[PDB]
Design an enzyme around this catalytic site. Structure first.
Site, PDB file in Angstrom:
ATOM      1  N   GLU A 126     -10.456  12.276   6.539  1.00 14.30           N
ATOM      2  CA  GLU A 126      -9.568  12.074   5.399  1.00 14.30           C
ATOM      3  C   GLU A 126     -10.294  12.464   4.113  1.00 14.30           C
ATOM      4  O   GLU A 126     -11.319  11.875   3.782  1.00 14.30           O
ATOM      5  CB  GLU A 126      -9.107  10.618   5.343  1.00 14.30           C
ATOM      6  N   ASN A 163       0.836  -1.194   0.000  1.00  8.19           N
ATOM      7  CA  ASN A 163       0.000   0.000   0.000  1.00  8.19           C
ATOM      8  C   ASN A 163       0.875   1.250   0.000  1.00  8.19           C
ATOM      9  O   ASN A 163       1.586   1.506   0.966  1.00  8.19           O
ATOM     10  CB  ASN A 163      -0.932  -0.003   1.213  1.00  8.19           C
ATOM     11  N   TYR A 202      -5.245  15.119  -1.766  1.00  3.67           N
ATOM     12  CA  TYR A 202      -5.408  14.284  -0.585  1.00  3.67           C
ATOM     13  C   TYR A 202      -4.902  14.978   0.674  1.00  3.67           C
ATOM     14  O   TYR A 202      -3.803  15.525   0.687  1.00  3.67           O
ATOM     15  CB  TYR A 202      -4.671  12.960  -0.806  1.00  3.67           C
ATOM     16  N   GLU A 237      -1.455   7.168  -5.365  1.00  6.45           N
ATOM     17  CA  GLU A 237      -1.629   5.985  -4.535  1.00  6.45           C
ATOM     18  C   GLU A 237      -1.741   4.725  -5.378  1.00  6.45           C
ATOM     19  O   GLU A 237      -2.352   4.738  -6.443  1.00  6.45           O
ATOM     20  CB  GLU A 237      -2.873   6.127  -3.653  1.00  6.45           C
ATOM     21  N   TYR A 240     -10.557  13.385  -0.158  1.00  2.00           N
ATOM     22  CA  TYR A 240     -10.037  13.083  -1.485  1.00  2.00           C
ATOM     23  C   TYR A 240     -10.705  13.939  -2.552  1.00  2.00           C
ATOM     24  O   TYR A 240     -11.926  14.090  -2.564  1.00  2.00           O
ATOM     25  CB  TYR A 240     -10.257  11.612  -1.845  1.00  2.00           C
TER      26      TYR A 240
HETATM   27  C1  LIG Z   1      -3.353   5.641   3.853  1.00  2.02           C
HETATM   28  O1  LIG Z   1      -3.405   6.328   5.079  1.00  2.02           O
HETATM   29  C2  LIG Z   1      -2.154   6.525   5.675  1.00  2.02           C
HETATM   30  O2  LIG Z   1      -2.222   5.992   6.966  1.00  2.02           O
HETATM   31  C3  LIG Z   1      -1.259   6.375   7.919  1.00  2.02           C
HETATM   32  C4  LIG Z   1      -0.969   7.893   7.975  1.00  2.02           C
HETATM   33  O3  LIG Z   1       0.175   8.118   8.741  1.00  2.02           O
HETATM   34  C5  LIG Z   1      -0.676   8.408   6.553  1.00  2.02           C
HETATM   35  O4  LIG Z   1      -0.595   9.800   6.633  1.00  2.02           O
HETATM   36  C6  LIG Z   1      -1.853   8.050   5.631  1.00  2.02           C
HETATM   37  O5  LIG Z   1      -1.431   8.314   4.326  1.00  2.02           O
END
Ligand SMILES: CO[C@@H]1OC[C@@H](O)[C@H](O)[C@H]1O
Length: 189
Positions: A84, A43, A75, A175, A86
């Site tokens: 969070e 990921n 993001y 991503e 997007y």
């Molecule tokens: C995908 O989500 C992540 O999960 C952990 C956080 O520290 C990161 O900023 C974030 O991108």
């Protein structure tokens, strides 16, 4: 148990996170340039932007090529309440907002965005393992270059009841999730 490599590069804040360091190569270039390249297991989320974020207009350009689960999006995070968000400008295979309750739509920057909201339970966040909400603005007409009025998205969200907290970081993120792909993206304002 995985914390992101953050810092500064080319006059911009950068954040790069992955649970499989060998599957992905993230590179900071001059200016607002960053290149990410991945394949196989893992990921990976990386990019350049601002800290903290605000209602700014984010210009961006470059090439974006996905093969499997992947997205190119504006993001970022907010705190109190923890959210969070997007602004999905592009994506491959899989629509990342899948399973997200649709709250409405918004026409901005040469296309229509679908607005979703979802909830992650006991998931990794900027404050570790927590249950938080995700705000989605998915572009119907995918692109790899253009400008994003983040304030417009924030307002459109505020209308349908998706209010935000005080901003944390705000980057142009590429991503990839257990897929292959590559992107060379330069950010600007
Ligand atoms: C995908 O989500 C992540 O999960 C952990 C956080 O520290 C990161 O900023 C974030 O991108």
């Amino acid at each position: 148990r995985t914390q992101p490599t953050t810092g500064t590069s080319g006059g911009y804040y950068f954040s790069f996170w992955t649970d499989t360091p060998n599957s992905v190569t993230y590179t900071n270039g001059n200016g607002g340039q960053f290149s990410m390249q991945w394949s196989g297991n893992g990921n990976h989320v990386g990019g350049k932007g601002w800290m903290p974020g605000t209602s700014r207009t984010i210009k961006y350009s470059g090439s974006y090529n996905p093969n499997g689960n992947s997205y190119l999006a504006v993001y970022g995070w907010t705190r109190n309440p923890l959210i969070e968000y997007y602004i999905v400008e592009n994506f491959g295979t899989y629509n990342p907002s899948s399973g997200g309750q649709k709250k409405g739509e918004v026409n901005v920057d040469g296309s229509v965005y679908d607005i979703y909201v979802s909830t992650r339970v006991n998931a990794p966040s900027i404050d570790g393992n927590k249950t938080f909400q995700q705000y989605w603005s998915v572009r119907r007409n995918k692109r790899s270059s253009g400008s994003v009025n983040t304030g417009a998205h924030f307002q459109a969200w505020k209308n349908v009841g998706l209010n935000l907290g005080t901003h944390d970081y705000q980057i142009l993120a590429v991503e990839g999730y257990y897929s292959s792909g590559s992107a060379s993206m330069t950010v600007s304002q």
